[PDB]
Amino acid sequence: KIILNGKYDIANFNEGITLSEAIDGVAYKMDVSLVEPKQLKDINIKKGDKIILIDIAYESKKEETIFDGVVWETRRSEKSKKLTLSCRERTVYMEESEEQYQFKENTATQRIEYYCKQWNIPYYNLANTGKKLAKVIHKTNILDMIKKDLKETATKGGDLFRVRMDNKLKLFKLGTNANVYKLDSILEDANFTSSFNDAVTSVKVLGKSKDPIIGTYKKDADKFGTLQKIKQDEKIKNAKEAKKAAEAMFNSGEETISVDCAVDINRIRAGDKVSLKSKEYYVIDVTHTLDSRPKMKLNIGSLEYIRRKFY
Amino acid sequence: FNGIARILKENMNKSVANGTFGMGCELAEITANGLKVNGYKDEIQDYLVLENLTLK
């Protein structure tokens, strides 16, 4: 409804906005399509411009900044003067800037604070993930390093954390959204899919590092059969770490719902805890599309499958 | 569709490079700070050696 840019208000030009995020996505993504007459052409929107989308929030019905990022790419058509943007929050910067860091044994929160301090990234008070990580040397992107240590934190019994940018970097635990919205009331169509596609019933740990930690921790072998994996990570250097990694991998296969909603719940985001029918599910992916009729589509799943796949 | 192929090939190189990192023999030099391995930004202050290198 309001698109601030730097100074102007280009909400008087946009054909539609689509706010999309994935649980493992690089960044909260806003793809706003505009018509580009002389008026919009004058201001000369370039890549790197700062877009802030403001719309009436679902919670309190007050205008709140639902998106605050930067224009990552502009594509302009000439025959039809339709300028199209693809906005990203500043976690896209972290996913592109490579750097090598050597880390001793420590927790994920300390590592994230170290990254932010090194690269001068503003950040709120980061939640203590608690889990203690093994010494590693990293080379991938900063977001890649953060995701790697968060995955290793999900292993060893730690809670599932996800990093979202907003104005200043936030360490967002998955099941900690304020409002557990119920989608059954506006359920245009749902697609309950169940499978054994990524089911894990057994896991045979073969430790590449010593405390000779080896074991098997089959959990539902009698019911679904011995759907076995082999976890052979150097980071597992402990018997309890092996047991917790095994326990953080068992699941009954893929179990998700491809939900389609006729009303756009504005504040939904990846990782949020949302209800369909009596059950509760975590948002694997959300794709708003703020056309003339607000609309939302969701892909949600159980905790076990999400932990198995994305962690 | 060539853009998808190029992006996917970039992903091939990315994944292969990440997998090959931290593996295989590498050259190095000893310093007062500690071991200095070629291709590493920081010196390794804790490392192992073969026992035949510990001779008086």
Partner: peptide
């Protein structure tokens, strides 16, 4: 009658490229 092919080839290319860039 024929522009559907161009439109939806563009949609397929955009969607797959978009997904690869996001997840990758």
């Amino acid at each position: 009658k024929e522009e559907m092919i161009q439109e939806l080839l563009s949609q397929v290319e955009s969607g797959i490229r978009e997904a690869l860039q996001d997840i990758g």
